[PDB]
Amino acid sequence: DGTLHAACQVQPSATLDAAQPRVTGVVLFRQLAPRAKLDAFFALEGFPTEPNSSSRAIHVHQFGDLSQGCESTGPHYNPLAVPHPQHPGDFGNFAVRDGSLWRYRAGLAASLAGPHSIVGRAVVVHAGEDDLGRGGNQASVENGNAGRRLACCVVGVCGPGLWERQAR
Amino acid sequence: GTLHAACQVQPSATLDAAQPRVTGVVLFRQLAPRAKLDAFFALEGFPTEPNSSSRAIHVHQFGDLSQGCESTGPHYNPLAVPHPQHPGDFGNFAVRDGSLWRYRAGLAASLAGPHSIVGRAVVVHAGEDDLGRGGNQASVENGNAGRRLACCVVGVCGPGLWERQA
Numbered sequence: 001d002g003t004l005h006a007a008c009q010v011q012p013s014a015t016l017d018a019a020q021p022r023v024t025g026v027v028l029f030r031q032l033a034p035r036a037k038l039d040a041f042f043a044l045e046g047f048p049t050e051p052n053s054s055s056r057a058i059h060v061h062q063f064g065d066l067s068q069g070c071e072s073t074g075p076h077y078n079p080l081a082v083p084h085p086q087h088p089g090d091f092g093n094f095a096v097r098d099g100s101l102w103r104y105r106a107g108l109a110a111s112l113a114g115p116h117s118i119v120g121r122a123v124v125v126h127a128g129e130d131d132l133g134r135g136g137n138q139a140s141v142e143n144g145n146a147g148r149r150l151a152c153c154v155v156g157v158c159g160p161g162l163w164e165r166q167a168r
Numbered sequence: 169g170t171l172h173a174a175c176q177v178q179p180s181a182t183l184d185a186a187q188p189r190v191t192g193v194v195l196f197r198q199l200a201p202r203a204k205l206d207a208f209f210a211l212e213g214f215p216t217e218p219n220s221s222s223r224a225i226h227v228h229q230f231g232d233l234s235q236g237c238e239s240t241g242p243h244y245n246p247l248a249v250p251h252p253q254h255p256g257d258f259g260n261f262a263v264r265d266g267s268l269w270r271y272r273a274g275l276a277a278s279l280a281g282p283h284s285i286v287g288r289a290v291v292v293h294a295g296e297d298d299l300g301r302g303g304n305q306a307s308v309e310n311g312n313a314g315r316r317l318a319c320c321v322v323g324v325c326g327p328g329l330w331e332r333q334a
């Protein structure tokens with residue numbers, strides 16, 4: 001009703017080397033009301049199956065600009081000028097098992113509405129684990145040392161269908 | 169403050185093997201929240217015969233590429249008006265030798281406000297928009313512009329693309 005829905009078709013970065021994995025999938029967002037915390041769904045494939053598991057970071061980056069693949073999306077979206085991992089799109093780490101990632105998350109800080117909306121911004125999936133600001137360099141407090149940008153998408157307005165169908 | 173947006177046009181995920189593969193960029197610039205929108209279109213990949221052709225580009229309701237361009241919904245119509253008065257009804261563009269290149273000023277779409285096209289879809293079609301003059305119901309809903317070939321989700325971007333791509 002006042003519920004907001006968004007979607008993001010994660011696709012490999014245009015700038016990848018042949019050696020890098022090619023990650024594809026979907027991120028869905030659902031926010032029951034403007035003041036509500038964000039719910040999300042993440043389902044990705046294309047990670048290496050050996051090693052059989054890994055931890056990978058996903059965040060929101062400032063610009064839905066895929067002109068240089070994921071590189072052109074800019075830094076973590078940071079409308080309140082705070083350190084990582086206080087950015088609204090700091091979604092954290094996700095467990096990859098046998099090449100796949102499948103996870104719902106709730107209580108996210110980001111919004112689909114208002115001045116700090118992530119609609120039209122980028123979701124970026126990284127090669128590495130987010131150290132959550134606990135590493136011993138400046139990068140830790142910018143991006144969590146999450147490493148190379150594997151795959152990304154622009155967050156789009158969508159209907160309720162995708163979320164309803166996925167939930168079943 | 170000026171707003172800029174970009175849309176990285178790519179072939180639909182759901183094309184068959186015999187359809188053309190159209191790629192390129194649409195850039196947007198809005199000087200103030202209630203200014204008319206300026207847009208730049210630069211695409212390639214159209215069939216090179218017929219050497220000349222006219223092809224429609226529109227904004228569709230949903231930035232949803234789950235089914236490629238098919239899942240982007242109908243034309244975005246926040247102000248409840250018939251085709252071709254939708255804000256993202258960009259009209260027909262001259263394609264010559266596979267390519268399309270055009271600047272349009274003073275479009276009645278917005279990057280700001282409740283009716284923003286940010287996060288919606290730009291869709292490039294195989295045919296020409298009949299601009300509401302086709303003589304049937306579809307004509308005043310979508311202009312009978314044929315199949316959806318290529319699309320993208322409109323993204324917030326910095327000033328750089330607009331300065332360089334012109």
Ligand SMILES: [Cu+2]
Binds near residue numbers: 124126143
């Ligand atoms: Cu990131």
Ligand SMILES: [Cu+2]
Binds near residue numbers: 226228292313
């Ligand atoms: Cu269209």
Ligand SMILES: [Zn+2]
Binds near residue numbers: 087
């Ligand atoms: Zn961050």
Ligand SMILES: [Zn+2]
Binds near residue numbers: 251252256309
């Ligand atoms: Zn229309």
